[PDB]
Amino acid sequence: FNMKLAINAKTITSGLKYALATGNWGSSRAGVSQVLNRYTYSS
Amino acid sequence: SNAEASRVYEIIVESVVNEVREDFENAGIDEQTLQDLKNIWQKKLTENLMLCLYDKVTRTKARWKCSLKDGVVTINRNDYTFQKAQVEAEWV
Amino acid sequence: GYYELYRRSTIGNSLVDALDTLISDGRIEASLAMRVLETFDKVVAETLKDNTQSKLTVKGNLDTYGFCDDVWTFIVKNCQVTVESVISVDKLRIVACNSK
Amino acid sequence: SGIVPTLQNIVATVTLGCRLDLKTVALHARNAEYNPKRFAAVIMRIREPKTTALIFASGKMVVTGAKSEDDSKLASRKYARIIQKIGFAAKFTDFKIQNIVGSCDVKFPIRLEGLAFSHGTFSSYEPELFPGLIYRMVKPKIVLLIFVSGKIVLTGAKQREEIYQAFEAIYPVLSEFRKM
Amino acid sequence: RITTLDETVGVTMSHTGMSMRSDNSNFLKVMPKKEILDYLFKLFDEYDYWSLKGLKERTRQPEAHLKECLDKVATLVKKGPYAFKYTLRKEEERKATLGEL
Amino acid sequence: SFNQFVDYTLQDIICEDSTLILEQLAQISRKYEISFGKIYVTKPMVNESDGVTHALYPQEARLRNLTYSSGLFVDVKKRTYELKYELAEESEGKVFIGRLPIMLRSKNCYLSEATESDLYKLKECP
Amino acid sequence: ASILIGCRRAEVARTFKEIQSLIHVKTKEFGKTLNIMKNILRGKSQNLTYIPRFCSHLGLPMQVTTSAEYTAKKCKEIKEIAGKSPITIAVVSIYLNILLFQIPITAAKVGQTLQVTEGTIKSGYKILYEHRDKLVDP
Prior knowledge:
The structure is cut from a larger assembly and holds 2 copies of chain A, 1 copy of chain B, 1 copy of chain C, 1 copy of chain D, 1 copy of chain E and 1 copy of chain G.
Chain D: E1 6-15, H1 22-28, E2 32-33, E3 42-46, E4 51-55, E5 60-66, H2 69-86, E6 93-105, H3 112-118, E7 123-124, E8 133-136, E9 143-146, E10 151-157, H4 160-176
Chain E: E1 3-4, H1 10-16, H2 33-46, H3 52-59, H4 63-72, E2 75-77, E3 85-87, H5 91-100
Antiparallel strand pairs in E: 2-3
Chain G: H1 2-9, H2 16-22, H3 28-43, H4 50-58, H5 62-78, H6 86-100, H7 108-113, H8 118-130
Helix pairs in contact in G: 4-6, 5-6, 6-8
């Protein structure tokens, strides 16, 4: 038993990173994340 | 010359005799026979040999080291009893 | 249990000699003599374990050594022995049985 | 140059030809050790030539510690005589040297990393694991341990000339990678 | 609340990854044969069930050697209260045969 | 909303189900148990390939194709039972579970405390 | 083995001890396997990187790191003990560089943190101190 092997960080890390990249919460949800519009400060 | 030795010896004689008494009484021999054994043994008791137990023995090149325990030695007609002993000897 | 090596000691030989006499000289039950020696083996062991304080130091030339059947035999020549006094011995024979 | 390697250890094998009772052997030999629980052989020793023998029940024997081939055969015959004297029908046969170790000093420091890079296929160097460079020579097939200090160890030889051959072959390389 | 570690952040990461530091805690770290065999057989008439442990305690020999000979005299029962214990199937003649061999 | 999630939700989620026990049987039965304590969040950081680790300010974060995140640590206490008998190793661990993206201007990111000219040094238009 | 290889081939560096912390390989057995694998790769035909990584563990300033780099190159050229594995030299080189500067790690903290025997760091320090003359970048 060694803690580093027991806990796998990319589970959480790459999980969230993935989700926000694709914006699919599951599909059970999609398009939740969207790249910001910098067209104009109003936009 | 050692005093602890004579004390140990005394403990041995006294301890053995009392324990042996049961068997002596069982064999229906004689209390005074037991007493004789005691007196003769102590009488006899009045060649550079050490009898003991070893904990560890090591060697490096021709150098030996030994950790001895619970023993008795007769060196130059004198008796010593010890708890521990360290031996540092050089072989050729 | 209990090794019979201590019978070769001064106190051990004396016991042997005493018993041998009671057997031969008298008519004292042999076999019982063995029972006694079995007691001796145990007593010397516990006594040397619980009733000793001395620490010895032996330094000299190793003339001979040997090992077989859990027994180490050493023969030290021209050695100085330190009790807790300094003694010198031309030839010392050591016989040691496994503590475990 | 001028340096010639010094032999440091010779390992040999000998067939006694008969089965042995190890307790008997250990008991009768003047300088023997035998603990069945640790290793299955009597470890016997003689003072001249100073060597150590590993004696097996099959009657096979390994003799090590000698500094010369002469000393190896001499000490081997001696161990065989001891077995005979103890009473077995032993015979001194099949004496064969299996390994010769040699060493020397080139007297200058060596750049191990450069050598390892240059002679990569024969070299192995991991200073954190072991400080010396392990050089596996093709002809002769000898293994050399090379140290920063300039001390050299040569091993794996069956004949003395191979130790000498390897050093002669390695010297130019050690020179090429000197520090001063 | 939740506390934000303010350090140089290098130390924390060093502990996170391979740190060159290990252990420091432990969790889930995880008589001759003639008389010997004769004596053991007298035990078998004395005990219909016994163990290699009881036999090794008596014979002071490795259980592996005890298991070999017992396979000849005794058989093993692995089921029931006596499970993992050998049961039997003249004794003086066997002892004299052991003395001869 | 994000700030409330960071302060309260992480602590509550970890606390709600942390305790897990292993049941060990022997023939004496045994337990092993691991609990999760106060969680710890860092400031935003970056792990470079070589392994050098350093703080991350968002500008560079954009330029280098990075993810702006802080690490998370958890206090793991491990216990062993033998059956409620309690032996175990505790305190001494602070464990890295993974990285959490961090919304800019939130309490966690470095910019939320910045001032005007401060921001200008970091080149994030106020 | 294959991991440590890919580290090497990737110009990244990881210590035998580090990987040894991810996996229990028993050590010496590992060296033999690694060497045979290395031989196979050739058949199929550098401490410096460690220095910044260590600073990270201590969170040291950049100047400290580059100072340490100059120190490592200078120490290797001056020879004298050849390094006794790179790890001791990298850590001692640091210990010098930091002690040049006012920033305390003291000693036991770096010996613990970086897993180098305190006696080792001080021993390296005496010899390194002797050559303080030529190691000075400015």
